[PDB]
Structure 1
Amino acid sequence: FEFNIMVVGQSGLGKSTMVNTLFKSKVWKSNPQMLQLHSLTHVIEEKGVKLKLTVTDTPGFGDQINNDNCWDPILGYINEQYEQYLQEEILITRQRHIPDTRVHCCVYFVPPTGHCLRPLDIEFLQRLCRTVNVVPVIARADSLTMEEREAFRRRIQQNLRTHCIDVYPQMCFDEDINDKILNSKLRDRIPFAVVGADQEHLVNGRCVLGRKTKWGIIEVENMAHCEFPLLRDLLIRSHLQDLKDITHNIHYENYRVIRLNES
């Protein structure tokens, strides 16, 4: 019943706002200077299904002049959870339920530059997708027009293919034809053009999360405004269990194979 998300990206990309946008979404009838990793856990529920959701907010990388090996604090934390799960699994006397602190999905925030992936993003995504499920998003997508979001999305998809970045949902995990059709529609939308908002607003008799601009409000849970519902339903509803299966059966097993061979 445990599910762990981690937001990863440069500072000023709306990551902390996105953590609050998830934890206060209207899908649920239940309302609820950083320099280290901070995990926020809330045992949420939707329609009679209890879920212990944990979202780990990360400090900003890429803000320094020298950002070489800035991925190691994140890659080190992910491997720590694999190592702790492995040590609990190899004990002679084990716990009846091993606590699952492994990251089941990483949400990587791409700056809305409108150009393409930067060398920093490529190096981070290449090493992240090797050990964890990664779903990239176009951060603060409202800073780009609808036509610019689509063109920027396509160029990123081209960068992911040229640099061999297998992003969730990985095409090598679609067995059923129904999965091949549903996931192909998702990969066409990744990276999601997301917009975050932790502020509520009264919009004609409805309470909604949104960003207040000059000529209206950007309802973040409205598909006609942004693609946050696509990211939200993937993580919480449609692909929650599949993310946990791939984390356990693929990523953790790969870590286990390496550790037991070098031992």
Structure 2
Amino acid sequence: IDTIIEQMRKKMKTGFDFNIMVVGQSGLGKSTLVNTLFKSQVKIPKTVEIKAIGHVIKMKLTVIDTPGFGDQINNENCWEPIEKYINEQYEKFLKEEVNIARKKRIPDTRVHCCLYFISPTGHSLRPLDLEFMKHLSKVVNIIPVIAKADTMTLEEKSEFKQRVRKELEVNGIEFYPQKEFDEDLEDKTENDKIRQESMPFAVVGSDKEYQVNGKRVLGRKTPWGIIEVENLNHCEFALLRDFVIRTHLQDLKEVTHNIHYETYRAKRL
């Protein structure tokens, strides 16, 4: 009997893979948001190693948690461990793609999406964050996210989202969705809304559940009330959730393959 239960836990073939990474200083809620993402589609220690966690939704969703980077006294080249991980998956894929083993289906561990967490300071972006995002954008789709958005009043949040958008433009930071890859009027219309209003996504994370309106929901219980993570009246996690998992999942993979990976392959060959 005990043996019989073991095979059941072993287990689900999937049609495709999607891989998201979270990146930024320690203490910004990255690991919490990883768990939040997983609990939206079904104490946390400091993260000391890059770790990939997968779950079947059929698709295999992998979320890659990372140690804090860009939070030290000296941060020169602090992006290199992340770059190394990303390029390792490109190299893996390159060799799998030649396909000597003649598989029908090729495993894809490449990072299709990188959530870059920005601390909610109210002020101009850190030069370090600008530099970090610049290096990452060369090799992966970057999506800027404002961490711990419950830190901000409504006015502070609007002001800061606008500041971040302006400073990304001024500094020439490539982030997804890139205007360069808008196909038509429908894409330009939807993506302009995303670029100019929705982004950067101001999120709150929690893997704790509370009953609100007689329903179990993800929420953050502060001493002043329960912040409902998936309620758009409370934060923008649901906008981020739907953007990455529903509306632009396929687009993120296509840019990853046809642009970032092809750039890797070009340089490799």
Tell me the CA shift for residue 66 of structure 1: 1.6
Q: 2:74 is matched with which residue? A: 66
Match of 2:141 in 1: 133
Within 1, Cα distance between the matches of 2:127 and 2:111? Answer: 24
Deviation at 1:91, TM superposition (A): 5.2
Give per-residue Cα distances to partners, 1:204-236, cap 9 Å, x unaligned. 311111111233211010000000011000111
Q: Give the 5 Å matches for 1:145-156.
A: 145-156=153-164
Quick check: 1:210–1:218 contact (8 Å CA) kept in 2? Answer: yes
Matches within 5 A, 1:104-123: 104-123=112-131
CA RMSD of superposed structures (Å): 1.2
State the 1:154 CA deviation: 1.0
Q: Map of 1:1-263 to 2, 5 A cutoff?
A: 1-25=16-40, 28=41, 30=42, 33-44=46-57, 50-90=58-98, 92-188=100-196, 189-260=198-269
Instruction: After TM superposition, give the deviation of residue 95 of structure 1 in Å.
Output: 3.0
Q: How many angstroms does 1:94 deviate by?
A: 3.9
Shift of 1:245: 0.6
Q: Is the 8 A contact 2:70 2:129 kept in 1?
A: no
Q: State the alpha-carbon separation in 2 of the partners of residues 194 and 80 from structure 1.
A: 30
- Is contact 1:194–1:227 with CA below 8 Å preserved after alignment? yes
1:34 alignment partner AA? T
Is the CA contact (8 Å cut-off) linking 1:78 and 1:103 kept in structure 2? yes
Identity over aligned residues, as a percent?
Answer: 64
Letter in 2 for 1:184: D
1:158: Cα distance to partner? 1.2
- Output the amino acid matched with 2:245: I
Count, aligned residues = 250
The question of whether the paired residues in 2 share the 8 Å contact of 1:88 and 1:95 is answered with no
- Native 8 Å contact 1:6 1:106 kept in 2: yes
The secondary structure found in structure 1 opposite 2:217 is: strand
Separation of aligned partners in 2, 1:92 and 1:61: 38
Q: Letter of the aligned partner of 1:226 in structure 2?
A: C
Consecutive unaligned residues in structure 2, runs of 5 or more = 1-15
TM-score, normalised to structure 2, is 0.90
- Partners of 2:101 and 2:213 lie apart in 1 by 59
- TM-score, scaled to structure 1: 0.92
* Structure 1 residue 203: Cα displacement: 1.5
**Deviation per residue, 1:169-196 (Å, 9 max, x gap):** 0000111100000000100121111111
